[PDB]
């Protein structure tokens, strides 16, 4: 089923049980707290920041890869397109959840930019 | 006794054992191998950006903070004045090594930057 993850900004992100596990944070939490479908909301992350966080994931999971070598995908770059302060929050996000993915891919595209 | 940890650039960078467990990274190969005082070169973190990594862990490791609420020490914000392709490095290297608080608190520098 899908565990409700509120925001900063209250909003319900709505995921399945089995891609949250891929952030060792929400994981670990479902661990202490036991399997459980209450609500887990996350007072750092916002729901703009959220909202890419877990549709990244999405595409992760549904998916498998969240990544290209020379093969970059329409999805997997318009996500990048994001503005400079917002693009350092995806990065706040991924380190806070310690989702290994997401946080890789974002701090090789600000690696790209300034050795590109 | 000093780990003998070389950069990308070849200096060796002699740094405690006990501090070297901090980073996730360079703890698990200390593991796989045993127990052993051979020299673990780095093949990703350059001279420059490694000798601030290991003094920021000598900080935290000889000095329990690295890291301030409203106590800013001179140090800990003088190593954060860098250039922002050096700050991106900084970022790279402290997730190459999965140091928890080097990573948070340089996320945290850019994050204040940009919200401030």
């Given at each position: 089923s899908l565990v409700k993850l509120e925001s900063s900004d209250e909003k319900v992100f709505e995921i399945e049980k089995e891609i949250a596990c891929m952030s060792v944070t929400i994981k670990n939490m479902i661990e202490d707290i036991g399997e459980s479908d209450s609500p887990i909301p996350l007072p750092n992350v916002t729901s703009t920041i959220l909202e890419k966080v877990l549709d990244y994931c999405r595409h992760h999971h549904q998916h498998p890869?969240?990544?290209?070598l020379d093969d970059i995908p329409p999805y997997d770059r318009d996500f990048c397109k994001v503005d400079q302060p917002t693009l350092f929050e995806l990065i706040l996000a991924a380190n806070y959840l310690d989702i290994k993915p997401l946080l890789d891919v974002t701090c090789k595209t600000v690696a790209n930019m300034i050795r590109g």
């Open positions: 890869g969240g990544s290209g």
